[PDB]
Design a protein around this nucleic acid. Structure first.
Ligand SMILES: [Mg+2]
Ligand SMILES: [Mg+2]
Ligand SMILES: [Mg+2]
Ligand SMILES: [Mg+2]
Ligand SMILES: [Mg+2]
Ligand SMILES: [Mg+2]
Ligand SMILES: [Mg+2]
Ligand SMILES: [Mg+2]
Ligand SMILES: [Mg+2]
Ligand SMILES: [Mg+2]
Ligand SMILES: [Mg+2]
Ligand SMILES: [Mg+2]
Ligand SMILES: [Mg+2]
Ligand SMILES: [Mg+2]
Ligand SMILES: [Mg+2]
Ligand SMILES: [Mg+2]
Ligand SMILES: [Mg+2]
Ligand SMILES: [Mg+2]
Ligand SMILES: [Mg+2]
Ligand SMILES: [Mg+2]
Ligand SMILES: [Mg+2]
Ligand SMILES: [Mg+2]
Ligand SMILES: [Mg+2]
Ligand SMILES: [Mg+2]
Ligand SMILES: [Mg+2]
Ligand SMILES: [Mg+2]
Ligand SMILES: [Mg+2]
Ligand SMILES: [Mg+2]
Ligand SMILES: [Mg+2]
Ligand SMILES: [Mg+2]
Ligand SMILES: [Mg+2]
Ligand SMILES: [Mg+2]
Ligand SMILES: [Mg+2]
Ligand SMILES: [Mg+2]
Ligand SMILES: [Mg+2]
Ligand SMILES: [Mg+2]
Ligand SMILES: [Mg+2]
Ligand SMILES: [Mg+2]
Ligand SMILES: [Mg+2]
Ligand SMILES: [Mg+2]
Ligand SMILES: [Mg+2]
Ligand SMILES: [Mg+2]
Ligand SMILES: [Mg+2]
Ligand SMILES: [Mg+2]
Ligand SMILES: [Mg+2]
Ligand SMILES: [Mg+2]
Ligand SMILES: [Mg+2]
Ligand SMILES: [Mg+2]
Ligand SMILES: [Mg+2]
Ligand SMILES: [Mg+2]
Ligand SMILES: [Mg+2]
Ligand SMILES: [Mg+2]
Ligand SMILES: [Mg+2]
Ligand SMILES: [Mg+2]
Ligand SMILES: [Mg+2]
Ligand SMILES: [Mg+2]
Ligand SMILES: [Mg+2]
Ligand SMILES: [Mg+2]
Ligand SMILES: [Mg+2]
Ligand SMILES: [Mg+2]
Ligand SMILES: [Mg+2]
Ligand SMILES: [Mg+2]
Ligand SMILES: [Mg+2]
Ligand SMILES: [Mg+2]
Ligand SMILES: [Mg+2]
Ligand SMILES: [Mg+2]
Ligand SMILES: [Mg+2]
Ligand SMILES: [Mg+2]
Lengths: 50, 251, 68, 108, 80, 50
RNA sequence: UACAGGCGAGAGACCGAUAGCGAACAAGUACCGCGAGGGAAAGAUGAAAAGGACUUUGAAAAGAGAGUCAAAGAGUGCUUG
RNA sequence: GAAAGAUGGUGAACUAUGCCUGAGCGGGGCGAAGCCAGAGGAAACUCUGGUGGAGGCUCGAAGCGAUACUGACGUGCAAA
RNA sequence: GCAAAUAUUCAAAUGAGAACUUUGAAGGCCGAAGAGGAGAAAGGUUCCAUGUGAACGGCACUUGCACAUGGGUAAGCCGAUCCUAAGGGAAGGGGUAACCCCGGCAGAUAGCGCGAUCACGCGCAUCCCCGAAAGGGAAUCGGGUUAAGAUUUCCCGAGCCGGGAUGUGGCGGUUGACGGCGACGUUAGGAAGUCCGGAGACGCCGGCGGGGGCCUCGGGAAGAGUUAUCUUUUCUGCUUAACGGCCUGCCAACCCUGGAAACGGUUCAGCCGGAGGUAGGGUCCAGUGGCCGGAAGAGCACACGUCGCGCGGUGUCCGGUGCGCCCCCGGCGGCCCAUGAAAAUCCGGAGGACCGAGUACCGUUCACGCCCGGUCGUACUCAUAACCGCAUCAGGUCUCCAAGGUGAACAGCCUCUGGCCAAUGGAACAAUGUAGGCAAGGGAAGUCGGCAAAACGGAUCCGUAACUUCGGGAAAAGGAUUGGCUCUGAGGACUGACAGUCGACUCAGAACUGGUACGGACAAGGGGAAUCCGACUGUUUAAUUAAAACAAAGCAUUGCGAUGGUCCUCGCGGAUGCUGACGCAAU
RNA sequence: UCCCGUGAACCAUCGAGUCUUUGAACGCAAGUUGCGCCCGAGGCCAUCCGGCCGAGGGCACGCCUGCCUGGGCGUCACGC
């Protein structure tokens, strides 16, 4: 809602910083196995439950 | 089986009294030196309807005995009281309707209401609308008096028990038919959750001793003994007789 | 939002500390003299241009006069 | 004809959410919120209105907000008791005190 | 009816976030966490769910302080 | 209040008014209005923003 | 004397990615449930990225030539297959 | 490979009931007490015409529900 | 299989590629209880710009609520925050093996509060905390501004509230002001403990009256539309906020004089009067009423003329109307075995301990002036795609605003503002379906059964049986009428049995007229004679049962006078009970 | 500049340090960055040699040893 608490606004902010594709240079490091962000979230597909 | 409706009321949950709009308790004023040895003068200020109760209530304002302030009490109004009346409380008060006197100050045959039982309990008897007690006798070698209660029973009470002269106002209320489920609904909305009532014979066996059967019937005597367990004591508890009242037993 | 009625007291109130400005709105049929004070904006409506010019001169030099 | 909308985020039509339609210089119709009406002060003795005092919402009577002539009536018990109630109390005070002596005249 | 019509009426939260454990298990009306038992001083845990125990024992977080006690025990807790 | 103080110690200027908002990603942003003595553009130049 | 926890070791006629702990991998993770709780899948290019410049067709993805390599028909989910 | 039995916990965001504090329910029909006027009468009172607007009254809009087609659908738009 | 929610078409642009994107034109729909404009909950970046290979958007896409990169939420005045409701937690104490369970049980109950400090005094009563973004409540309005923020957070202008100080001026000392017969008036006008009152502060229903907004009529100036014919015509607009004064003074309430029968005054209704009417004259109250300031400098509409948030000009009127609609208010009436919160906060009073000058000090709720105003939310959707239903699901989910015509009507039907044409397209028109019609003669023969359909239907006039608890039945039944046009009569207002002017609405009646049509679409009872059950209204097996079941009023029985009855609890203890026989409890 | 040296390092190791908001969680609470009180280095004026904004830091509960303040004819002594 537009009326929210600071604590809920704080957690929603962090969830946004985590919806980003991995940097390209991570894919180049020695002995690397990360392919993609396996935790990306879409607001219409998976709800935060908080 | 399961816990029956009569057993569910003692837990309180939805069966507590509906008292949001009530006006406070109705009683005499704490008995003191003024009322033991003389009389205290009060003025009736308002006659008010108390939700959940048929007797009207009288707001009497006294002057404090030893503090510079008012004392605002609340009585069960006797029939006849009116705003602006001076009521008098105490031991030397005149025998007038609305006055509060101890029973040693009331002749036999007098009509009284809000009678105490222990000296200072501030009123336990004859408090419903149009109800009164009658002073039958005095026994001066005990400090006790015999009164007749609304039920007809004769109780011996101290000669210092206070009472209000007259009868409780609002009498005759229950002579009017209600005619409607709706009128019963509004009556109980302000009292407690006891209405409507489903007959036990219309229940299933799991929730009532009378329940079940291919026809609605009790199937056992409806009179149950006094010492029956809770959940079993439904019907006519410890009944001495049943059937229509005739002759002497109706007296 | 507080109208003055006389040149006399308007001069006194335009001669106050924190009189920031005086505005002069020449209108139809009249001229308005508004003085910007701390709490209120005071207004005279002057009807004689001769009395209008006389008022202008007594406005004490320093008091910001705007012509619109 | 321009339907309107609330200007607060209180969206229900309670007594506190009172609106008035006004036409502003911009050619617009808007809602503006209003006070909810208060009864004014009353005399307990007779229930009647107290004269000479406006009917305002209780914080609107604060000393910092209303001039003292709008808050007071220049008589004993003023703004608390109406005129007749004062007159009755005076006579009753006087007469009953005069009755106190004529009962004490009987003490012989 | 039950089912689709009745699922449309989820609008009110029975649980919200808990300050002590962080899970959406704080029952607002009852005012206690169903997971950790807050505000009870002791933590809610049972031996009839060993799996729930191991989700929240020591070592599943940082051990901000107890991480270094092994190193301090060696060298018998020297203070400089 | 502290924003007003700190902008006087640093940049040696005066804030007529400070308005704040916590941005959607978690940081706070302060809009500082300079008292009409100082010039915002000249303050902008002395640090380098424009 | 005891010691499925903690920390630090050493072993084995044990298992060999559907096995062995649920988890060899950002696994008590993703995801589900209001909740208590439930709970996966998923390892292997090459010795070395040397991970395919350039030309040509195509809007592109790609194809056809070519180039690297012992090998690409080992071509970034790629040993065998 | 049960139907069960036990121990200890979690739910009234759906639904049940009580309590508190808010919001909401066109236009029509019938026409109870009370009241006014005229007429009749020894009286008691009656009669006539209005007025008025009662009621878990009535047709019905929104809302709330769910009788019938045992209609459609019945690997549905939909676990109603 | 892609079929509900009426619907698309033509040109052009773009592009590799257009039924699906964009602009223009046309044709349609929602039709305002909306497919319009905004919110509460819930979501969490979906908002906005730029770009984009795959995937995804059940056809497609240049496209997007997808993907990538950036940007975006501004408050002393809106909220939260403060107060209490139902209710929750809780210290000493009681119980408990312990986790835990008990709040009135009354304990040096937590907190002491107030005047004082230069120390002491007083008082301590039903007592702490939490609990409402719909209850209570310090204070804001108008105009601008963005790709995206603000209607009131930003800019321009104009105010207000709370706290803190302090100064100039004023006001009083008959110590603590004047005026009025009075109701009361004047923006100043001592006051300590203590006490008292008011507001906050309250149900539903009915009608009547008032204000604002809208709708509606006529006139004037501005622009536009129609114009072969007409049409002084049709369309659009012609604005003025909080706040500050002055006026006005509704309906009530109140004051003074006076003394009422031959009773009068009065409402739609009531009602009022020797406890003082009618009358005459005053006070006060409400206001979203009028004037001025704000404020024309703003906004809007025209017409001009110029390079770049240019500039200049014209105007921003006049009456009238109401069983109209929305909101609010006033004041009466009705209803109840129902009487329809609290507290914070603010205001007023009773009393009068104690206090000072007049070379001046004690004041003061006045005016002006000075400073300060913290924290968190604020974008966007609010739903036939942003919430829940495993989905971009014909489901479900609380509100505010609400135009014209027809009409009783927020019915249905058509239209304007605003919004859309999003539901994969093309061809053809077999059977069988599904949804919707019509059918000669007959008219329930069909079928378990009139299931389904048809028939009836609005309004005005007339007429209406059995039976009855005398209230009904009843819209019983049964009849007649209904368009258009041209007239006639009645029913009013104000101003000076009259004269003049004005006037929106209803009802009666007549002649003429038509291919006998006329509640012309829409909307909208079929009726009657009986039997059984339940008296009625009400309720019920969410998702196979709506009933004859449940409830109910009425009737009757039973227990109980408190050291009690019925009931809950492991215990402590508790519910009924803020109760007490016209009551509680059990049938 | 870190390369024959105070000297690189996603080095190892550990003694010196830092350690946001919470949590038994402790000033009162909590779907609140909500609501109090106390101290106070530093700076300003003077409405005092006081008052204003302060950097930082306190204020939970039960308990033990000591202490300070106090209460009650509970038991006394001594008085008045
Ligand atoms: Mg969803
Ligand atoms: Mg009930
Ligand atoms: Mg009964
Ligand atoms: Mg029953
Ligand atoms: Mg049954
Ligand atoms: Mg049984
Ligand atoms: Mg039976
Ligand atoms: Mg049966
Ligand atoms: Mg038998
Ligand atoms: Mg309202
Ligand atoms: Mg006054
Ligand atoms: Mg169920
Ligand atoms: Mg609900
Ligand atoms: Mg709940
Ligand atoms: Mg803010
Ligand atoms: Mg495995
Ligand atoms: Mg596994
Ligand atoms: Mg090979
Ligand atoms: Mg190979
Ligand atoms: Mg190999
Ligand atoms: Mg292979
Ligand atoms: Mg088994
Ligand atoms: Mg068994
Ligand atoms: Mg519920
Ligand atoms: Mg709920
Ligand atoms: Mg309710
Ligand atoms: Mg009905
Ligand atoms: Mg009906
Ligand atoms: Mg149905
Ligand atoms: Mg249906
Ligand atoms: Mg069917
Ligand atoms: Mg089928
Ligand atoms: Mg096919
Ligand atoms: Mg289909
Ligand atoms: Mg509406
Ligand atoms: Mg977008
Ligand atoms: Mg597709
Ligand atoms: Mg609170
Ligand atoms: Mg609130
Ligand atoms: Mg509110
Ligand atoms: Mg501004
Ligand atoms: Mg004076
Ligand atoms: Mg009150
Ligand atoms: Mg209320
Ligand atoms: Mg008069
Ligand atoms: Mg006004
Ligand atoms: Mg004006
Ligand atoms: Mg309405
Ligand atoms: Mg009334
Ligand atoms: Mg906002
Ligand atoms: Mg917004
Ligand atoms: Mg909407
Ligand atoms: Mg779900
Ligand atoms: Mg009409
Ligand atoms: Mg209509
Ligand atoms: Mg036929
Ligand atoms: Mg047949
Ligand atoms: Mg047949
Ligand atoms: Mg047959
Ligand atoms: Mg047959
Ligand atoms: Mg049918
Ligand atoms: Mg009949
Ligand atoms: Mg007619
Ligand atoms: Mg029935
Ligand atoms: Mg069913
Ligand atoms: Mg059914
Ligand atoms: Mg029944
Ligand atoms: Mg008892």
């Amino acid at each position: 809602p537009s009326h929210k608490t600071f604590r809920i606004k704080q957690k929603l902010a962090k969830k946004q910083r985590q919806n980003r594709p991995i940097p390209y240079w991570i894919r180049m490091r020695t002995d690397n196995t990360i392919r993609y962000n396996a935790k990306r979230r879409h607001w219409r597909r998976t709800k935060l439950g908080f | 089986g399961r816990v029956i409706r009569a057993q569910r009321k003692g837990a309180g949950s939805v069966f507590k009294s509906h008292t949001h709009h009530r006006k406070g308790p109705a009683r005499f004023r704490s008995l003191d030196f003024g009322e033991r040895n003389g009389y205290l003068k009060g003025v009736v200020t308002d006659v008010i309807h108390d939700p959940g109760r048929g007797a009207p209530l009288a707001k009497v304002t006294f002057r404090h005995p030893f503090r510079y302030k008012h004392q605002k009490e609340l009585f069960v109004a006797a029939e006849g009281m009116y705003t602006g009346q001076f009521v008098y409380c105490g031991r030397r008060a005149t025998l007038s309707v609305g006055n509060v006197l101890p029973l040693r100050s009331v002749p036999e045959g007098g009509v009284i209401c809000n009678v105490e039982h222990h000296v200072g309990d501030r009123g336990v008897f004859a408090r419903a609308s149009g109800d009164y007690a009658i002073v039958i006798s005095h026994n001066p070698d005990n400090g006790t008096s015999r009164i007749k209660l609304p039920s007809g029973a004769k109780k011996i009470v101290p000669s210092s028990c206070r009472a209000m002269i007259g009868q409780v106002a609002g009498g005759g209320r229950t002579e009017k038919p209600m005619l409607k489920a709706g009128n019963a609904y509004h009556k109980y909305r302000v009292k407690r959750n006891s209405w409507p009532k489903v007959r036990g014979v219309a229940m299933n066996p799991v929730e009532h001793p009378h329940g079940g059967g291919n026809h609605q019937h009790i199937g056992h005597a409806s009179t149950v003994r006094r010492d029956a367990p809770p959940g079993q004591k439904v019907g006519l508890i410890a009944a001495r007789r049943t059937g229509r009242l005739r002759g002497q037993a109706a007296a | 939002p507080k109208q003055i009625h006389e040149i006399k007291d308007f001069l006194l109130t335009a001669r106050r500390k924190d009189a920031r400005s005086v505005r002069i709105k020449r209108t139809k049929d009249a001229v308005k003299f508004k003085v910007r004070c701390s709490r209120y904006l005071y207004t005279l409506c002057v009807f004689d241009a001769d009395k209008a010019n006389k008022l202008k001169q007594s406005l004490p030099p320093g008091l910001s006069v705007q012509e619109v | 004809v321009q339907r309107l909308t609330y200007r607060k985020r209180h969206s229900y039509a309670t007594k506190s959410n009172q609106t008035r339609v006004v036409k502003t210089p911009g050619g617009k119709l808007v809602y503006q919120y209003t006070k909810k009406r208060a009864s004014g002060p009353k005399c307990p003795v007779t229930g009647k209105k107290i004269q000479g005092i406006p009917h305002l919402r209780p914080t609107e009577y604060k000393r910092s907000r209303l001039s003292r002539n709008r808050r007071t009536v220049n008589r004993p018990y003023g703004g608390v008791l109406s005129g007749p109630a004062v007159r009755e109390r005076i006579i009753r005070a006087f007469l009953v005190e005069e009755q106190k002596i004529v009962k004490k005249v009987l003490k012989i | 009816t039950k089912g689709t019509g009745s699922f449309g009426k989820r609008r009110n939260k029975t649980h919200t976030l808990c300050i002590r454990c962080g899970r959406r298990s704080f029952h607002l009306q009852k005012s206690t966490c169903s997971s950790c038992g807050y505000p009870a001083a002791r933590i809610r845990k049972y031996n009839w769910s060993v799996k729930a125990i191991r989700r929240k024992t020591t070592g599943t977080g940082r051990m901000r302080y107890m991480r270094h006690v092994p190193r301090r025990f060696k060298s018998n807790f020297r203070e400089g | 209040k502290k924003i007003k103080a700190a902008v006087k110690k640093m940049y040696d200027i005066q804030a007529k008014k400070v308005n704040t908002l916590i941005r959607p990603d978690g940081k706070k942003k302060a809009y500082v209005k300079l008292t009409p003595d100082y010039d915002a553009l000249d303050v902008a130049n002395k640090i380098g923003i424009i």
